[PDB]
Amino acid sequence: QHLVLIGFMGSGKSSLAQELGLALKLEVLDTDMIISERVGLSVREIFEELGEDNFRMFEKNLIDELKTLKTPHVISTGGGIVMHENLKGLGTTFYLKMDFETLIKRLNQLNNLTQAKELFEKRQALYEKNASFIIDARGGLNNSLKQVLQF
């Protein structure tokens, strides 16, 4: 019953979450921002100062915490959130699916993209394992929004 958006950073999750919240009259949460606000450091400062182990532990526990909310929320999530076995059951999960070339274009706001593409294929497989629905993100925000509402 929460509507959880998963996928790569730069796919459009935050913007889609905001629109979804408006369309459905739902409050919107962002897991990276909640963690950042609890610790008082930015996500990058957390990784630098406190280490990824701490970040991942905060993320795992926050997943548990949100499972206790009674009212449905739209939840956007960090790219690594699918590493957690407990993400399953948080809510209905939508993978905002962009092809690699589009995503690299969006992120760009000698072997070069080989490693990026390996990381892409491995993380995409985890997004799909964890998804209730796959949204085709290639048509832009409104087309993604339309899919979610129809689904």
Q: 3-state SS of the chain?
A: CCEEEECCCCCCHHHHHHHHHHHHCCCEEEHHHHHHHHHCCCHHHHHHHHCHHHHHHHHHHHHHHHHCCCCCCEEECCCCHHHCHHHCCCCEEEEEECCHHHHHHHHCCCCCCHHHHHHHHHHHHHHHHCCCEEEEHHHCHHHHHHHHHHC
Amino acid type, 43 = V
Separation between Cα atoms, residue 33 and residue 11, nearest integer Å: 17
13 is in an annotated binding site: yes
12 is in an annotated binding site: yes
14 is in an annotated binding site: yes
Paired tokens of 17: 């979450």
38 is in an annotated binding site: no
Supply the range of the domain harboring residue 18.
1-151
79 is in an annotated binding site: yes
- Which technique was used to obtain these atomic coordinates? X-ray
Q: Say how many domains are in the chain.
A: 1
123 is in an annotated binding site: yes
11 is in an annotated binding site: yes
32 is in an annotated binding site: yes
- CATH number, residue 116: 3.40.50.300
| Backbone dihedral region for residue 97 (phi beyond 0: left; psi -120 to 50: alpha; all else: beta) | beta
